[PDB]
Design a protein around this ligand. Sequence first.
Ligand SMILES: O=C(O)c1cc(=O)[nH]c(=O)n1[C@@H]1O[C@H](COP(=O)(O)O)[C@@H](O)[C@H]1O
Ligand SMILES: O=C(O)c1cc(=O)[nH]c(=O)n1[C@@H]1O[C@H](COP(=O)(O)O)[C@@H](O)[C@H]1O
Lengths: 209, 209
Amino acid sequence: RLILAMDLMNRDDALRVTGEVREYIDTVKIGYPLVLSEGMDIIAEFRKRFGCRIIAAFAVADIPETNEKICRATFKAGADAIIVHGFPGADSVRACLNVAEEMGREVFLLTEMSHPGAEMFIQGAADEIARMGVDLGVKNYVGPSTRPERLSRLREIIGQDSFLISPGVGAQGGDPGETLRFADAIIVGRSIYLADNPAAAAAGIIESI
Amino acid sequence: RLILAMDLMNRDDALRVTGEVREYIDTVKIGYPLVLSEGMDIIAEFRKRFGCRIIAAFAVADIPETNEKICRATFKAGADAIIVHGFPGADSVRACLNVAEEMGREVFLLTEMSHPGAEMFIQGAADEIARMGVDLGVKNYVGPSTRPERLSRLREIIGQDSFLISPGVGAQGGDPGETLRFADAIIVGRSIYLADNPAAAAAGIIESI
Ligand SMILES: O=C(O)c1cc(=O)[nH]c(=O)n1[C@@H]1O[C@H](COP(=O)(O)O)[C@@H](O)[C@H]1O
Ligand SMILES: O=C(O)c1cc(=O)[nH]c(=O)n1[C@@H]1O[C@H](COP(=O)(O)O)[C@@H](O)[C@H]1O
């Protein structure tokens, strides 16, 4: 129930840490910090070297036509799933869902974000964003570890059969156990990759739950 | 280093056995016996329910244009890789490789087959089929558990960095340990899925190696 957020920017460090904690995870979330520094080929390299599923954390948030292009390039690169913002609206989300269907991949809908600024505009639209996801047939969602009461409400909207993952554990203040009361899996980045012993940090999280 | 060949024909039995042996495998090989009986949607169902990588054992062996169509449909259905015959020639293999590249997926090249009949025509062409794979950039291969001396020769041609999987273990007479002297992983079907206790059978194989 642990997903590693691999946001280190250099290939050597990213490969080292991911290899050290492989036994504690099954999925690696790779985003722009690593991809823009080392190239999209890093996705296929990780998939091959570690045999883990890869979620591309690209917070897709453009118009439908551009979202389609981003999703196509991302799935061509080997990602198993992509994270898409719901705030830009249904047409933008549908464009991503259409490419995922064409390529046999998945879309994760980012509802409410975990950082403080999410309270300004996203939080007020999050319940409706989750409902839009349900209406569009979305089965995978992202919600905040930092606000378990919001994570509970989002779980209420999407149902027990939807898959919900949650970032904000550790560095941002979220608790593994409390988050897993509602999410199926937790995303952890810095608490593991900036640790003196990433494997010990991962093991500690797994033990705490 | 164990791949389950799930050749049961009904969804209920296939799901039961795969769930029972999940802890001993990481990849499920699904072929036409199950897909033609239950539909291509079974691939996505397995991927979701078990979180395993799926190799579509479709022994692709048609002209380039048709191979492209088969690969596209197979990857759209969610398969992570597809098994392609090398005997029909380089253009037929290249067509599959092109679709795999477009979709961020992989091709496994079937060189020499494991059954007795493979000695009639395939065996005599197998070394050249493997060399053709190397020339085309193929990195994943299938070779016979039933003939470890042939598996050794094929490993010699493709190199240590290529990934080699091998069927024919158990029912067809192949030995897990001897096969793993050359292959990276073994494929096992009947010895596990027809057993009175599939999990015990899988565990026994893992223990024997
Ligand atoms: O889209 C995301 O992955 C994301 C959404 C969100 O609301 N909050 C959030 O933290 N993330 C990401 O999840 C990861 C969390 O990393 P840490 O705070 O280091 O554990 C980072 O890659 C973030 O960019
Ligand atoms: O393409 C294959 O997967 C295949 C190639 C080959 O040379 N030999 C071979 O047995 N297979 C398949 O691998 C599986 C082996 O199953 P069992 O003999 O029951 O363990 C079946 O799905 C076969 O169709």
